[PDB]
Design a protein around this ligand. Structure first.
Ligand SMILES: Cc1ccc2oc(C#Cc3cccc(C(=O)O)c3)c(CC(=O)O)c2c1
Ligand SMILES: Cc1ccc2oc(C#Cc3cccc(C(=O)O)c3)c(CC(=O)O)c2c1
Lengths: 137, 137
């Protein structure tokens, strides 16, 4: 559906990367949070939903179900939190890592290349075009 | 054009709000930066360009032309920086300000409502639909 996302956390250089995947497009947004805090996750979701239709977020564990601020964010923005690979991100992060002082910069460079690039280098739509194409329809 | 943005800074409770406007849609993204630093502006632009086609950014003063990191961001992402109202944002910020501890949260609530809402309350497209509609074409 046009509003279905997947939310997962990954780890690099002792910091936390929050990753949202639009499941139908493979479009990603990500942020480095100082710790695995609710506030930061609530803030990330509010930003995401102001930008894209975000109707249902799927997570794989209990963490997001125990944050009072994530719950208030879900309600304010009208996001259903439901219970129940894309770390080629980390390969791209290694390719750029030394073009950037900060990890957060290298993550955003990785997200930029993930979203802009064509599948297998050539022809048809990038993840960033697919999400616009899906939402346009 | 589909890739034309406007970048301006505004101020509230002694902090800096970075605002990008997609000129053809009125779609906005914004962030509270600790100070009016280049790094923060470079980071904001890199994030923006990974999400939308960003071809030309117009600013009204010299500040962005004297940051080495904004310059490296422009080059990395392929953004032309060119020299040469939407603070109904601040009215919406006042309406939500007390639904949020942090200013950054109230800004994102304001951006969410700016982008989601219909012009004069009823009918035809929001700023968020317009930018997708323009980029789809
Ligand atoms: C209803 C709703 C929706 C979204 C939200 O995001 C936040 C937050 C946050 C945040 C992010 C990074 C750093 C820090 C810091 O203090 O260092 C805070 C809130 C909490 C509030 O503002 O009431 C919130 C609430
Ligand atoms: C080529 C290019 C493109 C985009 C970029 O963004 C940054 C940055 C930053 C930033 C934001 C918030 C907080 C802080 C902090 O240290 O407290 C830093 C850079 C600098 C680097 O990473 O080399 C950069 C470079």
């Amino acid at each position: 559906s046009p509003g279905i996302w997947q939310l997962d956390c990954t780890h690099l250089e002792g910091k936390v990367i929050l990753v949202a995947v639009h499941v139908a497009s493979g479009y990603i947004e990500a942020e480095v949070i100082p710790a695995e805090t609710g506030q930061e996750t609530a803030y990330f979701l509010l930003k995401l939903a102001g930008r894209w239709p975000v109707k249902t977020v799927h997570t794989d564990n209990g963490s997001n179900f125990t944050s009072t601020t994530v719950k208030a964010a879900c309600e304010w923005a009208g996001i259903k939190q439901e219970f129940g690979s894309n770390k080629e991100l980390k390969k791209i992060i290694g390719q750029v890592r030394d073009q950037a002082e900060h990890l957060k910069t290298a993550v955003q460079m990785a997200v930029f290349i993930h979203n802009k690039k064509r599948k297998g280098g050539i022809g048809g739509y990038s993840a960033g075009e697919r999400i616009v194409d899906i939402i346009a329809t």
